[PDB]
């Protein structure tokens, strides 16, 4: 029956709002109290005032905020009906891989073709400034921006993304999973949830479900580059430290 | 209205049984099948440091518990109509007070029900621990003995725990008016329920409102201990 899921879709929006303070809705407003834009070396030196080299400072900046994003997605995951009940060793597995795919989804919410929100929306930072960095980091965030723009085209809601965020973490198709059946069953309901939500919220985006499920192809492909790229920067610069929570995931 | 109150009582009760798989009725039934843990040796058998592993299962369950509490607060009339920030606050603080209340329904003098009922840890086993954990649950056991002496049923608890949840004095509530507004309602319902289901028990109502002073005691003191437990996985620490 519908109300089964309609109400499940509600439970998850409400947790979504309660777990991530920068929503797609809040970003879209501040991308159309305006952000301080950074598009040059010095505008970064203002960015300190207003809100080791730059490419390394700015990389370590992506890392702190991601340690706090991983915090946010754990909080959200606990909320998902079933997840807390599952095997403990697999909870840790689902997050270990389920995190990054979530990140570059929420990322897209903060992105347009031109750049990316920063410091909780306080600032903006160009897609072309980023390209113009130090040899390893001049390619740090480029495919993100590419996928951001194709992914954002579906023009998803927050309420949509909350169920899709759910489906992601509860994969089953993940490496190291002892009990796969109960994961895959939670997801059968989340997919069932998601299906009706895309019909109702976006009644024109025909095969939006299909076209959304399709973007999990793009998403892993992104994670793969980030991993081996992230793996380089350790060899280039063993001076750099990583946060242990980020270590675990990686 | 004498009839409205009897309605809130039932809506709350009903939601409570859906919300909580293991009732105090059937937890009492069990207590008088369950695999007991009384030795170290029973333990390594029932699984199929050691002081650490036991503490940390209390953890995994304590987090399952939280979720079924959040599910249950949903059905409290107009709970959801509250400011979402305020919902988070009420749950955040009340959750612990309701865990020991429900941990009473699993406890008797000599130990506590385990694994959603399939087990029984001796109270004397629990007492027989290391200084970091050898009087961990000892305080708890005294609360539940005195608490269970009020012979509340789940019909009463289901109204009682709703009231814990909406206690309007929590740190950081933004709009306290409706929070107390509902609590006034659940109080009015709990009065009628205690006076109906136990007309023999005089001032039971008054006596339940004092154990809430105990609950706030046992919860700060437990807080105090899970920071003393910080004087002895990164992704898992974050889970808890
Ligand atoms: O501090 C920040 O919030 C920040 C930073 S770090 C920073 C912020 C202000 C001045 C200097 C550095 C960042 C760096 C990149 Cl290359 C991309 C996004 C960044 N952000 C925003 C952000 C980072 C990660 C995620 Cl998952 C979402 C938003
Ligand atoms: O998973 C359980 O059912 C359980 C546990 S979990 C456990 C069982 C066997 C060995 C180690 C941990 C538990 C531990 C303690 Cl020191 C006290 C009560 C405990 N329980 C009963 C319990 C029921 C509910 C909640 Cl909120 C917390 C604990
Ligand atoms: O030992 C326990 N919990 C715990 C474990 C790890 C971290 C924090 C609390 C426990 C706690 C409660 N409680 O606090 O309401 C109930 C049952 C077991």
UniProtKB/Swiss-Prot annotation, chain A:
UniProt induction comment: (Microbial infection) Expression increases when incubated with M.tuberculosis or its lipoprotein LpqH; induction is TLR2-dependent (at protein level).
Name of the protein in question: Peroxisome proliferator-activated receptor gamma
Motif (9aaTAD): 244-250
Illness the protein is tied to: Defects in PPARG can lead to type 2 insulin-resistant diabetes and hyptertension. PPARG mutations may be associated with colon cancer. Obesity: A condition characterized by an increase of body weight beyond the limitation of skeletal and physical requirements, as the result of excessive accumulation of body fat.
UniProt binding sites for rosiglitazone: 63-66, 100, 226, 250
Organism the protein comes from: Homo sapiens (Human)
Designated gene of the protein: PPARG
Homology family: Belongs to the nuclear hormone receptor family. NR1 subfamily.
Compartments where located: Nucleus; Cytoplasm
Cross-link (Glycyl lysine isopeptide (Lys-Gly) (interchain with G-Cter in ubiquitin)): 18
Record's comment describing the protein's domains: The 9aaTAD motif is a transactivation domain present in a large number of yeast and animal transcription factors.
PTM summary: Phosphorylated in basal conditions and dephosphorylated when treated with the ligand. May be dephosphorylated by PPP5C. Ubiquitinated by E3 ubiquitin-protein ligase complex containing FBXO9; leading to proteasomal degradation. Ubiquitinated at Lys-18 by TRIM55 leading to proteasomal degradation. Ubiquitinated by E3 ubiquitin-protein ligase STUB1/CHIP; leading to proteasomal degradation.
């Amino acid at each position: 029956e519908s109300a089964d899921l309609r109400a499940l879709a509600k439970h998850l929006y409400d947790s979504y709002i309660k777990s991530f303070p920068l929503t797609k809705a809040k970003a879209r407003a501040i991308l159309t109290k305006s952000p301080f834009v950074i598009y040059d070396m010095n505008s970064l030196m203002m960015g300190e005032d207003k809100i080791k080299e730059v490419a390394i400072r700015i990389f370590q900046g992506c890392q702190f905020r991601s340690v706090e994003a991983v915090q946010e997605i754990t909080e959200y995951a606990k909320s998902i009906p079933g997840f807390v009940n599952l095997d403990l060793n697999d909870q840790v597995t689902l997050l270990k891989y389920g995190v990054h795919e979530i990140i570059y989804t929420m990322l897209a919410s903060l992105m347009n073709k031109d750049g990316v929100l920063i410091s909780e929306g306080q600032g903006f930072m160009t897609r072309e400034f980023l390209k113009s960095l130090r040899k390893p980091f001049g390619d740090f965030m480029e495919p993100k921006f590419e996928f951001a723009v194709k992914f954002n085209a579906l023009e998803l809601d927050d309420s949509d993304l909350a169920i899709f965020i759910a489906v992601i973490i509860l994969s089953g198709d993940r490496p190291g999973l002892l009990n796969v059946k109960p994961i895959e069953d939670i997801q059968d309901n989340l997919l069932q949830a998601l299906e009706l939500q895309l019909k109702l919220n976006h009644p024109e985006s025909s095969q939006l479900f299909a076209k959304l499920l399709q973007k999990m192809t793009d998403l892993r492909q992104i994670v793969t580059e980030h991993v081996q790229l992230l793996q380089v920067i350790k060899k280039t610069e063993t001076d750099m430290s990583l946060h242990p929570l980020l270590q675990e995931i990686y």
